[PDB]
């Protein structure tokens, strides 16, 4: 055999979507239980209860690299927190089909009086050769389609921007992944083309989005002409604004304040 099919985390119960390689003795329990803070997984309600009363953690275990109102993001090294990032990944694998030491993990949380509650995360290669600025990305099911996923995406590109590099998520993307990325890409590019005469290489330099990713989005928006083996921006500001009212490309409800990001390349 039996797999893990149900987990309990904070106050949510979540069915699994995919096989996750927990040990055999864990998959056989009817349900599984975790710290919403330290992410220890457990086999029984009774040992969950003891842990709830003993665990001192009230937030993820890295550096709080971003903060604005009750939204915070945590930078967690793969070498420095092997077990945590190991449990994060097995949590991730229940909802993704896609060693933790080569990676850094960025934990999205909304905070209250009790602590910083995990909502979603993304990982990324400390140094990526094919320039993947995202390895894995995931909004926990109870939080999906509320802007958290598009926030994670926006955060990964602001990191790239502070890095003087362009990036692209590792493939493949979940169906949600595809949707969230076209939306984020489109909203960003349109707003640029709403104010500013710019080339594709120039759009990529502003946004850290790869040119292939820029091309295919403007392609999808039908805003590029093809001239003798060259892609050329060609957009009416009218059609620009028409696309912005589309629910597919409407501004995301929650947004990354670059001032509130305190990170160092």
- Give the annotated binding-site residues for propanoyl-CoA: 137, 139, 145, 149-150, 174, 183
55 lines the binding site for Zn ion (CB under 5 A): yes
Q: Which is nearer to Zn ion, 40 or 68 (CB)?
A: 40
Task: For residues 211 and 230, give the distance between their C-alpha atoms in angstroms, rounded to a whole number.
Answer: 12
The answer to whether 189 and 203 are in contact (CB under 8 A) is yes
From the list Zn ion, Cl ion, none, partner contacted by residue 150 (C-beta under 5 to 8 A by kind): Cl ion
Q: Can you tell me which residue has the tokens 């209860």?
A: 49
Binding mask 35-54 vs Zn ion (x if CB under 5 A, - otherwise)?
x--x-x--------------
Q: Which is nearer to Zn ion, 39 or 136 (CB)?
A: 39
Q: Which is nearer to Cl ion, 35 or 108 (CB)?
A: 108
Task: For residues 243 and 250, give the distance between their C-alpha atoms in angstroms, rounded to a whole number.
Answer: 8
Candidate residues 60, 78, 120, 149; the one interacting with Cl ion per rule CB under 5 A:
149
Is residue 170 flagged as an active site residue? yes
244 lines the binding site for Cl ion (CB under 5 A): no
Q: Half-sphere exposure of residue 157, counting CA atoms within 13 Å on the CB side?
A: 22
Binding mask 100-139 vs Cl ion (x if CB under 5 A, - otherwise)?
----------------------------------------
Q: Half-sphere exposure of residue 107, counting CA atoms within 13 Å on the CB side?
A: 27
Work out the angle between the directed axes of helices 237-244 and 175-195 (0-180°, nearest 10): 140
150 lines the binding site for Cl ion (CB under 5 A): yes
Candidate residues 3, 14, 51, 59; the one interacting with Cl ion per rule CB under 5 A:
14
Q: Half-sphere exposure of residue 196, counting CA atoms within 13 Å on the CB side?
A: 14
Residue 73 exposed, middle or buried by CB count within 10 Å (0-12, 13-18, 19+): buried
Task: For residues 215 and 206, give the distance between their C-alpha atoms in angstroms, rounded to a whole number.
Answer: 14
Please list the active-site residues.
Answer: 170
Applying CB under 5 A, the residues found at the interface with Zn ion are 35, 38, 40, 55
């Amino acid at each position: 055999s039996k797999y893990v099919d149900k987990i309990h985390i904070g106050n949510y119960e979540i069915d699994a979507w995919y096989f996750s390689p927990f040990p055999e003795d864990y998959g056989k329990q009817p349900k599984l239980w975790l710290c919403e803070y330290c992410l220890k997984y457990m086999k029984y309600e009774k040992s969950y209860r003891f842990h709830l009363g003993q665990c001192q953690w009230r937030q993820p275990p890295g550096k709080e690299i971003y903060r604005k109102s009750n939204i915070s993001v945590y930078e967690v090294d793969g070498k420095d927190h092997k077990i945590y990032c190991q449990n994060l990944c097995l949590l991730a694998k229940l909802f993704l089909d896609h060693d933790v030491e080569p990676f850094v993990f960025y934990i999205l949380t909304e905070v209250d009086r009790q602590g910083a509650h995990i909502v979603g995360y993304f990982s990324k290669e400390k140094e990526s050769p094919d320039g993947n600025n995202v390895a894995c990305i995931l909004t926990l099911p109870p939080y999906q389609r509320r802007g958290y996923g598009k926030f994670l995406i926006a955060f990964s590109y602001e990191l790239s921007k502070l890095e003087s590099t362009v990036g692209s998520p590792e493939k493949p993307l979940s169906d949600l992944g595809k949707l969230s990325y076209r939306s984020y890409w489109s909203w960003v590019l349109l707003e640029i083309l709403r104010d500013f005469t710019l080339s594709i290489k120039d759009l990529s330099q502003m946004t850290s989005i790869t040119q292939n990713d820029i091309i295919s989005t403007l392609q999808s928006l039908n805003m590029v002409k093809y001239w003798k083996g060259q892609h050329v921006i060609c957009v009416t500001p009218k059609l620009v604004e028409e696309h912005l009212k589309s629910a597919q490309y409407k501004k995301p409800p929650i947004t990354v304040d670059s001032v509130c990001l305190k990170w160092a390349p």
